Symmetry: C2
Subunit: 217 residues, 2 copies
């Protein structure tokens, strides 16, 4: 796998609360240099990222209700539709973990479905961050099933803000659960080329990476 | 300070991503038992908290654009006014730390001003979480002054999700900066009644606390 085609798996990510305009521009510069799939940012930076990436193949994408996944669904929808309208091409939402752990599958479903409807109405795609760190293995499986039922296009491992991120065995469990019907995005704590390749081998079809420069050089 | 009057300083807080309905209910049960000022939750739980606290003097309050403070201003505003409409009496927003660190004060101010105007239009009050852990001391001062200028009613130390929370020296600095013109809320890592009293003496007029039971017993 060449650096160019590895880059195509990567949503180059910068989500730190203290990222400055200069920090965000550098992330954009890096993504354009390596031609990654996307630049992934918090919704405030979407207009700027869109401007920076204009005329390139790199897509701006946004997280929403992130990283806690406990934002009211209607407010998540507003954040998502605004982000898409301002240039986002994909939306990575966060699972309502508390409702899943509490066994309220119908509420978990309603939450994702509202985002899926809004995102798909604009012709874009939706990823659901499971936050595997906070889930039992059975819950990881259930979260994938509900994500699929609600119409999500991808399941994504982690926000990068919990106690751990992408794990080879979790990625494999996710890929087994969704089969080839949804994408699987390994994210969080991916620090080396070897780790990136292992996630792809475990079944990831996309990756969230912030240490992208170190991995591609 | 009586336990009953100490409770009136406290926004009893449960913001964890894996908080279930039962977890949130327990937080409401505790706040009602000790008559705290508020129950503070992520916006998804505002209708439930409002129902649980109905007929009592405990206020539901919501965080917004939380904890990263990097949500588009218009989306923070919608999250806030939606939360108020569902029963939130106060809104704790997060500073746009990235724009503050970048020295872009006009954007920091415009961000807080949008929330202040929207929250005040509904007759409610706004707290601005500075996230002191991420800031230089001059930045804490500037953040306080920008919050004051934008019309905020409180400055608040921390989200509870960064590297550190409320520090006595930071609280003093905040109180000195806003004088008696704004409230000062100490939050994050307040674990003992002794620590709580310390925060009050350093100048806090309100506190965010999760270990509320331990503290009040």
């Amino acid at each position: 796998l060449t650096t160019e085609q590895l880059a195509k798996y990567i949503d180059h990510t910068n989500l730190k609360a203290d990222a400055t305009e200069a920090d965000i521009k550098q992330t954009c510069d890096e993504a354009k240099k390596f031609n990654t799939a996307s630049v992934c940012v918090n919704s405030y930076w979407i207009p700027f990222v869109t401007e920076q990436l204009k005329g390139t193949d790199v897509n701006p994408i946004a997280v929403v209700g992130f990283p806690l996944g406990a934002m009211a669904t209607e407010s998540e929808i507003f954040e998502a539709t605004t982000a898409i309208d301002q240039g986002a091409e994909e939306i990575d939402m966060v699972l309502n973990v508390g409702e899943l752990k509490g066994g309220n599958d119908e509420k978990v479903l309603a939450d994702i479905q509202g985002l899926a409807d809004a995102v798909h109405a604009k012709g874009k795609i939706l990823k659901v961050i499971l936050e595997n760190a906070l889930l039992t293995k059975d819950e990881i499986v259930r979260a994938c099933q509900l994500s699929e039922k609600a119409g999500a296009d991808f399941v994504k491992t982690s926000t990068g803000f919990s106690t751990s991120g992408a794990k080879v065995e979790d990625v494999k469990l996710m890929r087994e659960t969704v089969g080839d019907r949804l994408g699987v995005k390994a994210s969080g704590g991916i620090h080396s080329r070897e780790e990136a390749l292992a996630m792809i081998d475990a079944g990831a079809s996309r990756m969230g990476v912030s240490a992208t420069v170190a991995i591609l050089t």
